[PDB]
Design a protein around this ligand. Structure first.
Ligand SMILES: *C(=O)c1ccc2c(ccn2S(=O)(=O)c2cccc([N+](=O)[O-])c2)c1
Ligand SMILES: *C(=O)c1ccc2c(ccn2S(=O)(=O)c2cccc([N+](=O)[O-])c2)c1
Lengths: 306, 306
């Protein structure tokens, strides 16, 4: 029993975290085989941050300008190249702790674990969701550039996020491991801001199913809804429209609990329209939207508490 | 910026998790040096769970009755002894991944990371608080016996919790690493239940300070309170009484924000008496009580957003 925001065990990633230094700039890098990945912002001159030309900045560097520290060992850089907003640094030694890994581009609404890191030293691990506006609600201080987000399945690490910057609202933006930003952000100082965000409807529905699996049904009702009738209410409360694809994804949870998806949609519609009435669901008074249907099946029992 | 429930990186603990099997019972164990720690419930006969005599159950076992699996390697048990509600199994090989470690008995209100594990395989990591009633609000399924709770400081792992059982309300009970239960619970089938719980006042205060550090002050007011006047209101809302020791602990956070502790106590008193008014604090509508003053200093910037 119970339901917690749960991260993947971080050991396989901790063994890949290194420190990368260019002159007076230090941040974190990811050491896989004989390559070290890090934000290209490491090469950025202090008193120019508005208009950096990274191609012109990087042509001026040699291999030995990069200091890469793995623990108390220095790694020798024997090659470098730019890939979108990251640098790939080839080093003289293959990381002996490299796990089986893959690079993946996560989709909005999906969740992943973040290993917050400073000066190449992991500091904490937490779970978060890629918001529809392509930011994450992380917890990061100065020095966290290059911290990594990931998921794990069967001893394989799927890296999906490298951290770059904090936006003015206090949320966070970064790239995949090919160096392509999530969302419309760029790695320079501009007036860029997070766009308007939405609530992840599919995840709220999954979390209501988790609540039933664990034994709570107080929020159900005797009604059903059409998909389009639900989406009219979703629009008014800044929820994402529900699609048939999302209904299909909820199939297994629907089967496990015996609650048809559109019946749960009617329950959510009443919750949006009437509020919580001073009640909680899995310990929360807010409708939680950072658990995916996958996360619920992973964490919840396969047997409903009927 | 940001504030998340953040666990310690789990790699140093993952390297210690093994599987322990007695006949048809399997659970998790902790392998440090040449010793494997696990719940003594592993030796329990299926159709007797009410009145087990563990001394009589254990005298009937040999060293070779214990199967201990570390990955795909079998460890040879060459000795066993009971310590309170745990077994200490000496094995033929020292764990090469043993970290610098210590055993600590955590106090009520303190926080720690849980590495949830099944069949000796770590599955997830999350943060939780030792409740005043000596339970934790974990997330555990069958097979989680022997999962470990811990804190890390400067590469040293402080183990404080080994998981045993789920109580009827869905919360969780277990022992320290000397095998002594937290709270008045015993490792057999009884009508035992979690006692009445309370809200951890010191932690709520710390979390309000975290909210100010990150830039939010909406809940402050122009009033102050006496310690005893606050405790009269705390009693009525099922908060723990605040002590001078707790006021002293809040010193550094008070200094960083310029808000005297008893002034924050007045702010909390108004929040309890008037409610939230449909507002949030660090993203929450409930007053959060599972962050210690230490946790706040660890995660929050040292510079207040004034
Ligand atoms: C780390 O990898 C990193 C740190 C600062 C970065 C960055 C890309 C751009 N910048 S920045 O110009 O210093 C910056 C920081 C915060 C916000 C914004 N912004 O324009 O909103 C820019 C990478
Ligand atoms: C694992 O270490 C473990 C599993 C079950 C245990 C246990 C000690 C006692 N029991 S139990 O008798 O099966 C049990 C389980 C849940 C609740 C209660 N209870 O009396 O409340 C007992 C250790």
């Amino acid at each position: 029993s119970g339901f917690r925001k749960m991260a993947f065990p971080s050991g396989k990633v901790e063994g890949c975290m290194v420190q990368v230094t260019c002159g007076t700039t230090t941040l974190n890098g990811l050491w896989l085989d004989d390559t070290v990945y890090c934000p290209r912002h490491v090469i950025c001159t202090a008193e120019d941050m508005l208009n950096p030309n990274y191609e012109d900045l990087l042509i001026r560097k040699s291999n030995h300008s990069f200091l890469v520290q793995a623990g108390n060992v220095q790694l020798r850089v024997i090659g470098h190249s730019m890939q979108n907003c990251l640098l790939r640094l080839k080093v003289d030694t293959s990381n002996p702790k490299t796990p089986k890994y893959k690079f993946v581009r996560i989709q909005p609404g999906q969740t992943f674990s973040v290993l917050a890191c400073y000066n190449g030293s992991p500091s904490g691990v937490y779970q978060c969701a890629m918001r529809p506006n392509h930011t994450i609600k992380g917890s990061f201080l100065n020095g966290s550039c290059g911290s990594v987000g990931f998921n794990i399945d069967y001893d394989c690490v799927s890296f999906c996020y490298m951290h770059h910057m904090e936006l003015p609202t206090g949320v966070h933006a970064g790239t995949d491991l090919e160096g392509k930003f999530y969302g419309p952000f760029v790695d320079r100082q501009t007036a860029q801001a997070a766009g308007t965000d939405t609530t992840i409807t599919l995840n709220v529905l999954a979390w209501l199913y988790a609540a039933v699996i664990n034994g709570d049904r107080w929020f159900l009702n005797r009604f059903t809804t059409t998909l389009n009738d639900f989406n009219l209410v979703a629009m008014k409360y800044n929820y994402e429209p529900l699609t048939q694809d999302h209904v299909d994804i909820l199939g297994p949870l629907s089967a496990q609990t015996g609650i048809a998806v559109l019946d749960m949609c009617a329950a959510l519609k009443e919750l949006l329209q009437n509020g919580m009435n001073g009640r909680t669901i899995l310990g929360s008074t807010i409708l939680e939207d950072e658990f995916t249907p996958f996360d619920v099946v992973r964490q919840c029992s396969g047997v409903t508490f009927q």
